[PDB]
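User: I'm new to structure prediction. If I give you an amino acid sequence, what do you actually give back? Let's try with this one:
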Amino acid sequence: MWIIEAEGDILKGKSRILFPGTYIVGRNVSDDSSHIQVISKSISKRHARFTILTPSEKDYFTGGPCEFEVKDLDTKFGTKVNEKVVGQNGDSYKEKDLKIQLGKCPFTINAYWRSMCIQFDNPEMLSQWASNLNLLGIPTGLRDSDATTHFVMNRQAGSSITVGTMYAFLKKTVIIDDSYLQYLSTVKESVIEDASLMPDALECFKNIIKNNDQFPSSPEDCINSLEGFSCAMLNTSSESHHLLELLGLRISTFMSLGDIDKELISKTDFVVLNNAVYDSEKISFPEGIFCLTIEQLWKIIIERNSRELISKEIERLKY
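Assistant: Good question. You get back a string of structure tokens that encode the predicted 3D arrangement of the chain. For your 319 residues, that looks like this:
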């Protein structure tokens, strides 16, 4: 998101978030969702046009900013951006840092890009929110990205948190839900006038951990809590692989379940199964080895006992 700020009284001492759209900047306009007042003497009645475009396809993956367009409105004294004269048919900027000077006025309008990219847990929630967030200048997606700052979990009364959510939690990502997204959309226009009115994602996130029995005390407790243990794992999602590695697990990945040699048993402490293979193939899985789902493993992880809990369960199924 583009934030603008000024080092005089010229923006009233308020930061503004500039969502995708078009803003008339000058001294005779008021404060709309589409008008910005700037008091100074050397600036025209209607001085500048700021136009913020919606995110590019790459912005989710690069973290780069929405295009910021600056048009001078046939001004006597002109407009400058980064000390270079804007004129002609305007200019468009892709840098994260913009110094905008209007006329001979020494107090400058400073645009800066604050990172916010939102990953979703599934296609269903994405479809529900994509276009909306696109209009708020927030890149969205399903794939992993080094630019992601926030992850949206599916909130559901019945079941476990998903693997996606377990992983985002352990990766140290801020987790948010549907209701934060509702909040952000109702206060859109108010936040343009005052950046500090921006809904706080950390409050939503801290509230989720507190109100939920499906989250450990801290991501830091879990990381490397199972180092020293090794497990075998039938195929599974790539989220599942990386999740287990963060827990400090040595991972062997078999395919058939009939790929279980004496080799594996002798060097594997327990085994992680898909939901499907766990329920029906209780007739054909190995006799000595402890078997659990990712869902159950996570429930072990939440406990204070984790290692003592798995240890004594290997000793139960070995005698």
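You can read the tokens as a compact description of the fold. Here is one thing that stands out. The chain has three domains: 2-115, 117-217, 218-319.
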